[PDB]
């Protein structure tokens, strides 16, 4: 692959949930099992800079991750926006509080996604293009977290799962539209993960964690290699 590959983003790109984190990345938790590393190993780009970081928000991408982008960059991947909208806080609320509290918190997040996130995404997307004029940029969306089925243990109430899935749909809608607006490819992770959500019976996502590292709602190693990687392969 001609040109450098720069992998930007949050925990869904660093690989939280896939295991084997490189200690040198600290709390960013990047791993060779994450789709950017899998893609780079198979495609041999001129250079590979993996700067995604667990917990990253749009301002972090602008402040800490733009350095490797340059005129020789030919491919850029990115997952970002979920944390700006506070989805980790939303999930904590939905797990530890009542269904009513969950809905209210989800609705506050959805309002932010519609009114505030677009502007932040435009800012990140425009700066990426400014620093890497020639790169093909692939913005990957997020998966839906749940399969709505007959009473699922620990999987939350149906009403909460519905609300959370609805929030993912709205987030992915905003991202897909912003990506198209900038001529960027949109990676449909929700489509790729259909039939592999929590409660699906063949999940590629971690359920809520009560012990260990918190990789709740994140892709497993199978989700990274079977879901994210093929999506990037299709758009790179």
Residue 77 bears catalytic tag: no
Q: Which helix (H) or strand (E) holds 39?
A: helix 35-43
**DSSP SS3 for 68:** coil
Is 206 considered catalytic here?
Answer: no
Distances in Å between the alpha carbon of 71 and those of 4, 107, 158, 183? Answer: 9, 41, 48, 18
What gap in Å lies between CA 52 and CA 227, rounded to an integer? Answer: 18
Method: X-ray
Please state, in angstroms and rounded to a whole number, the distance separating the CA atoms of residues 44 and 157.
45
- In angstroms, rounded to a whole number, what is the distance separating the alpha carbons of residues 187 and 191? 9
Half-sphere exposure at residue 79, Cβ-oriented, CA atoms within 13 angstroms: 29
User: What element of type H or E holds 229?
Assistant: helix 229-235
Residue pair 45/75 in contact (Cβ under 8 Å)? The answer is yes
Q: Which residues pair with 140 in a beta bridge?
A: 187
Q: What are phi and psi of 96, to 5 degrees?
A: -95, -10
Q: Label residues 179-206 b or e (16+ Cβ within 10 Å = b).
A: beeeebbbbbbbebbeebbbbbeebbbb
Residues in the chain after which the backbone breaks (C–N beyond 2.5 Å): none
The answer to whether residues 223 and 196 touch, using CB atoms and an 8 Å cutoff, is yes
Q: How far apart are CA 62 and CA 128, in angstroms?
A: 8
d(CA 26, CA 43): 26
Q: Which of 13, 14, 77, 218 is catalytic?
A: 218
11, 13, 77, 216: which one is catalytic?
A: 11
Resolution of the model in angstroms? 1.8
**Edge-to-edge strand ranges of the sheet holding 4-9:** 47-50, 4-9, 73-79, 136-140, 185-187
CB atoms under 10 Å from CB of 236, counted, come to 18
Of 11, 79, 3, the C-alpha closest to 43 is 3
Q: Domain boundaries in the chain?
A: 1-236
CATH 3.40.50.1110 for the 1-236 domain, yes or no: yes
CA 16 – CA 52 distance, rounded (Å): 10
DSSP 204: S
Helix (H) or strand (E) holding 49: strand 47-50
CA dist., res. 133 & res. 23, Å (int)? 32
Side-chain half-sphere exposure of 170, counting CA atoms within 13 A? 21
């Amino acid at each position: 692959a001609a040109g450098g590959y720069v992998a930007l983003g949050d925990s869904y790109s660093s690989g939280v949930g896939a295991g084997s984190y490189d200690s040198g990345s600290g709390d960013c938790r990047r791993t060779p099992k994450a789709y950017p590393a899998l893609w780079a190993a198979a495609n041999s780009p001129a250079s590979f800079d993996f700067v995604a970081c667990s917990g990253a928000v749009t301002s972090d991408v602008l402040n800490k991750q733009m350095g490797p982008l340059n005129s020789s960059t030919s491919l850029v991947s990115l997952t970002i926006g979920g944390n700006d909208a506070g989805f980790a806080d939303v999930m904590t609320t939905c797990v530890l509080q009542s269904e009513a509290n969950c809905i209210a918190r989800v609705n506050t997040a959805k309002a932010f996604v519609e009114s505030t996130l677009p502007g932040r995404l435009d800012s990140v997307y425009s700066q990426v293009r400014a620093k890497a004029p020639s790169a093909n940029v692939v913005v990957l969306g997020y998966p839906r977290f749940y399969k709505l089925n007959g009473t699922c243990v620990a999987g939350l109430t149906e009403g909460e799962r519905t609300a959370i899935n609805g929030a993912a749909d709205l987030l992915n809608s905003v991202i897909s539209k912003r990506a198209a607006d900038h001529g960027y490819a949109y990676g449909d992770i929700a489509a790729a993960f259909t039939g592999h959500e929590i409660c699906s019976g063949d999940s590629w996502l971690h359920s809520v964690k009560w012990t260990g590292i918190n990789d709740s709602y994140h892709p497993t190693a199978a989700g990274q290699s079977g879901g994210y990687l093929p999506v990037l392969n299709s758009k790179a």
